[PDB]
Amino acid sequence: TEFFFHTMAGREGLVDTAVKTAETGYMQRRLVKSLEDLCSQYDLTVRSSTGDIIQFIYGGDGLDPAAMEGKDEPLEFKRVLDNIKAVFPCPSEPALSKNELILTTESIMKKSEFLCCQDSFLQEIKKFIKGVSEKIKKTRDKYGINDNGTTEPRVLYQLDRITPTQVEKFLETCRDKYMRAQMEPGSAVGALCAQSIGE
Amino acid sequence: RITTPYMTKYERARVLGTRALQIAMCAPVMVELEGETDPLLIAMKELKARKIPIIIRRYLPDGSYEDWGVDELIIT
Amino acid sequence: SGSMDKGTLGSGSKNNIFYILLRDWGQNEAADAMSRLARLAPVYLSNRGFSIGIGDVTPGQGLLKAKYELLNAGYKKCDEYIEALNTGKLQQQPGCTAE
Amino acid sequence: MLLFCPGCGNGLIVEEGQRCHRFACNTCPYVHNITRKVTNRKYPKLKEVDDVLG
Amino acid sequence: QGRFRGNLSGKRVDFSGRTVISPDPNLRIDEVAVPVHVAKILTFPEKVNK
Amino acid sequence: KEDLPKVVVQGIPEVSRAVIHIDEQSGKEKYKLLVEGDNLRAVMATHGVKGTRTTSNNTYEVEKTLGIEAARTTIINEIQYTMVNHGMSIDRRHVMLLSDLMTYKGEVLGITRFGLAKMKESVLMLASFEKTADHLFDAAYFGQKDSVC
Amino acid sequence: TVAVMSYSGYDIEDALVLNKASLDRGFGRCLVYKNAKCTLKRYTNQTFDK
Amino acid sequence: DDEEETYRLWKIRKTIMQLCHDRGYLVTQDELDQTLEEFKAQSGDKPSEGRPRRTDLTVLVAHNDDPTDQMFVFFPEEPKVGIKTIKVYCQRMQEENITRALIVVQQGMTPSAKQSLVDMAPKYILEQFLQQELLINITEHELVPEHVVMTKEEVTELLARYKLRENQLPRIQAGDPVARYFGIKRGQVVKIIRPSETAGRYITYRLVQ
Numbered sequence: 001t002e003f004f005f006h007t008m009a010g011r012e013g014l015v016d017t018a019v020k021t022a023e024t025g026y027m028q029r030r031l032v033k034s035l036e037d038l039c040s041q042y043d044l045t046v047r048s049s050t051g052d053i054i055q056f057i058y059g060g061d062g063l064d065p066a067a068m069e070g071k072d073e074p075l076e077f078k079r080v081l082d083n084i085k086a087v088f089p090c091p092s093e094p095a096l097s098k099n100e101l102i103l104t105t106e107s108i109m110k111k112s113e114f115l116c117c118q119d120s121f122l123q124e125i126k127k128f129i130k131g132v133s134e135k136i137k138k139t140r141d142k143y144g145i146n147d148n149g150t151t152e153p154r155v156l157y158q159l160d161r162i163t164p165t166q167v168e169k170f171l172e173t174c175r176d177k178y179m180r181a182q183m184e185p186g187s188a189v190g191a192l193c194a195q196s197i198g199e
Numbered sequence: 200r201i202t203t204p205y206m207t208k209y210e211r212a213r214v215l216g217t218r219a220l221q222i223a224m225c226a227p228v229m230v231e232l233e234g235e236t237d238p239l240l241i242a243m244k245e246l247k248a249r250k251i252p253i254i255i256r257r258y259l260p261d262g263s264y265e266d267w268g269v270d271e272l273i274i275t
Numbered sequence: 276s277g278s279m280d281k282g283t284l285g286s287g288s289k290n291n292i293f294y295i296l297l298r299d300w301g302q303n304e305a306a307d308a309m310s311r312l313a314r315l316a317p318v319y320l321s322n323r324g325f326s327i328g329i330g331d332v333t334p335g336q337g338l339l340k341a342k343y344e345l346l347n348a349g350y351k352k353c354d355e356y357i358e359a360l361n362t363g364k365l366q367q368q369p370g371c372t373a374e
Numbered sequence: 375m376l377l378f379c380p381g382c383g384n385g386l387i388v389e390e391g392q393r394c395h396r397f398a399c400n401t402c403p404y405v406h407n408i409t410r411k412v413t414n415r416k417y418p419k420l421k422e423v424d425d426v427l428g
Numbered sequence: 429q430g431r432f433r434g435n436l437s438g439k440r441v442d443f444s445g446r447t448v449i450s451p452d453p454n455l456r457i458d459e460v461a462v463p464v465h466v467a468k469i470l471t472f473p474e475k476v477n478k
Numbered sequence: 479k480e481d482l483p484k485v486v487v488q489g490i491p492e493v494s495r496a497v498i499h500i501d502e503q504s505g506k507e508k509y510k511l512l513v514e515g516d517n518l519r520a521v522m523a524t525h526g527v528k529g530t531r532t533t534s535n536n537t538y539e540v541e542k543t544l545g546i547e548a549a550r551t552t553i554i555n556e557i558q559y560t561m562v563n564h565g566m567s568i569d570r571r572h573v574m575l576l577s578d579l580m581t582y583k584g585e586v587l588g589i590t591r592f593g594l595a596k597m598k599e600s601v602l603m604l605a606s607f608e609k610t611a612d613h614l615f616d617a618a619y620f621g622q623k624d625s626v627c
Numbered sequence: 628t629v630a631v632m633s634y635s636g637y638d639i640e641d642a643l644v645l646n647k648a649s650l651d652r653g654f655g656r657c658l659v660y661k662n663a664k665c666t667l668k669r670y671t672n673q674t675f676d677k
Numbered sequence: 678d679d680e681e682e683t684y685r686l687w688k689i690r691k692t693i694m695q696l697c698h699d700r701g702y703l704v705t706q707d708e709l710d711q712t713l714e715e716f717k718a719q720s721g722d723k724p725s726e727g728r729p730r731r732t733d734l735t736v737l738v739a740h741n742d743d744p745t746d747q748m749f750v751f752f753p754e755e756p757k758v759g760i761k762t763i764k765v766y767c768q769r770m771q772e773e774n775i776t777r778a779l780i781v782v783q784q785g786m787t788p789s790a791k792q793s794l795v796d797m798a799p800k801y802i803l804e805q806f807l808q809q810e811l812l813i814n815i816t817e818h819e820l821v822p823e824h825v826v827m828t829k830e831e832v833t834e835l836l837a838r839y840k841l842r843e844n845q846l847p848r849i850q851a852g853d854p855v856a857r858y859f860g861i862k863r864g865q866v867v868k869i870i871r872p873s874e875t876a877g878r879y880i881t882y883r884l885v886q
């Protein structure tokens with residue numbers, strides 16, 4: 001009886017998959033035949049074949065879903081900061097405090113190459129910088145680390161160690177990733193959407 | 200000047216294909232190939248050297264156009 | 276630290292070492308790393324030996340005892356519920372009937 | 375409710391006669407006057423209180 | 429099997445083959461092995477250049 | 479005697495079944511209404527119902543009641559929820575593009591042949607998808623010139 | 628004599644590794660027989676296929 | 678009755694005030710923030726409350742555009758409005774020289790009355806509104822984004838920045854609930870601010886057609 005019930009379940013699954021194959025095949029055919037006309041133009045506006053605009057900007061922001069590092073987000077600031085700290089450790093430079101970190105961030109972000117970047121990404125960068133600066137402040141207040149750089153135990157500076165070089169590297173890497181993660185004009189976005197919804 | 204300064208993968212592909220076809224059609228080489236019998240390899244070498252004499256003509260949907268040099272654009 | 280698994284080397288989701296290589300150092304580095312892994316893992320797996328036998332799936336004495344006790348308890352509770360429903364009033368869960 | 379004539383067995387409609395309402399058959403002169411009250415309850419199942427699932 | 433679906437949208441082409449697959453981890457991810465028998469049939473037109 | 483027992487005395491005729499769902503959040507246990515009907519306007523118009531936070535599954539009702547943007551948002555949320563139920567995730571940009579393409583003419587047009595014809599204009603594509611002879615003869619009658627865009 | 632184990636990574640997904648000497652000594656050797664039929668029929672006229 | 682009817686009337690009045698404020702008409706803060714106690718003080722019973730006359734509004738004037746422009750709001754008492762009532766409202770607006778008027782029906786509009794209202798006059802603009810729809814404000818709904826009717830200058834700036842035409846913009850039917858809520862006509866453009874998952878917003882545009 002147990003073997004018969006197991007065979008029943010197996011055949012049920014088999015027929016389910018058999019119906020699913022054809023059903024999803026038809027659905028994919030329809031979705032692709034309907035969405036094969038859209039394309040990303042050079043002015044960041046998704047337009048149909050007749051010239052009508054479907055979206056003034058793809059996804060509201062204009063980022064490539066294939067180049068999405070985070071969960072529906074362009075970058076994971078924590079991972080990028082850790083990678084920058086690990087790849088470029090500067091032992092000959094002192095650590096930065098909250099005020100110094102905020103000052104260098106505001107001075108670097110106001111450059112020309114950062115003007116063309118979207119405002120939301122800059123606001124997210126500012127929020128992450130403020131968060132890490134508050135964390136550094138809390139750490140230094142817990143361990144009484146002085147911003148002057150004359151504390152006797154230097155190992156205390158290794159808890160949250162940040163140098164302006166690492167800050168600049170992090171900002172440049174984030175900007176480059178955000179610029180290279182945008183929708184490249186000419187891509188058949190409609191067909192990609194149809195396939196990603198059909199599969 | 201308003202479009203993205205980065206050279207997309209589609210532009211890369213089309214430029215490489217056109218240059219490979221031209222080289223296969225007895226076009227002059229500007230990188231002094233070293234035993235490369237494959238035209239696509241020569242095209243990739245010219246792209247990496249930024250010596251492809253091709254200017255992309257990006258058209259806007261309304262009708263406006265803009266010229267961008269291969270050496271002027273940014274490659275990855 | 277840590278041991279590699281599908282969560283780090285598999286094609287499940289982000290946080291994959293090959294994904295980090297692709298996003299940090301380009302495509303060629305990730306391809307070379309994948310080739311090196313595909314060329315190294317088989318050699319070590321063959322030199323070490325990995326096999327499965329009937330003894331790898333046989334149950335233990337304590338396992339059989341626990342299974343027997345659990346089956347007895349479950350059958351007793353099922354019989355109690357059957358007796359409660361057939362003869363008497365059984366607590367009806369919300370949003371559904373007694374059966 | 376459904377009632378039948380003892381004569382032929384067809385359904386009995388209710389009609390207003392010259393003195394009082396009466397059951398009558400459409401295929402014969404048989405009639406039956408109503409003397410006392412006649413009722414036919416159905417007792418529908420009501421709505422029950424349903425519960426706060428969740 | 430109409431003209432739109434059978435001869436315009438999807439149509440058969442030449443210079444193509446169909447074969448069974450087998451594992452081979454000694455090749456790169458961007459590389460594929462082709463048998464000598466099929467390689468001698470599928471030809472590529474190369475233009476004679478300098 | 480056969481129709482009187484089925485005459486409504488209270489409630490919306492379109493509503494067939496409504497249940498009291500409860501969310502047991504640790505902060506507070508709240509109650510909501512899950513209605514298995516096809517009338518959102520009546521549900522929102524009823525007393526004691528917070529019409530500002532009322533959603534629905536039928537896209538046509540949302541379109542007809544709260545506009546086309548509400549229909550787009552409902553389509554996006556419903557597709558995302560249906561996809562998450564199976565444990566598989568899709569980038570929100572794909573569903574956003576789909577909903578916009580379905581809601582760029584002011585009316586929710588489906589992917590079927592009817593909506594595809596109402597949206598697209600190329601004769602060759604419509605003839606290739608479905609209704610080949612019908613669309614071809616209609617174009618020959620209208621003399622509609624089809625571009626190669 | 629099958630041995631359940633991983634070897635050379637050439638048996639990743641459902642594939643199996645065969646022994647060269649086993650196949651050399653007759654293991655798995657198979658025979659395929661095909662038929663080729665021809666007909667020499669007489670037509671209406673007094674002529675036959677030769 | 679006498680408890681839910683007055684509540685519906687108060688909520689409809691508040692929704693009409695919010696709609697007039699969104700359209701740009703002149704309405705004081707007291708009319709916008711009107712509690713149920715004030716409505717009871719005005720009328721606390723159904724028979725005492727006058728739907729056809731006691732609830733009518735004539736002070737609605739577009740102070741931002743021109744004080745001379747006047748808008749009227751009607752509340753027919755009968756469930757279904759006939760041709761005679763529409764003609765009476767039209768001649769009343771003619772006497773009072775009012776071009777824009779609203780009709781808040783109770784149950785619906787007869788097909789003949791609808792067809793007549795459609796072709797009353799290009800100068801006499803009357804919009805049909807069901808009380809069931811006005812019991813909830815469409816703008817306050819979480820799904821409905823923020824809509825703002827753009828002026829001709831903003832439309833020209835948009836078309837110049839994007840180098841587009843009017844027909845190339847996304848369409849939105851005139852019969853859309855939001856379209857009738859704002860009373861936008863053919864040719865006008867509406868900017869929509871969709872709230873994204875992040876702190877940013879997505880700005881789009883739609884043309885009435």
Ligand SMILES: [Zn+2]
Pocket residue numbers: 378379380381382383384398399400401402404
């Ligand atoms: Zn009878």
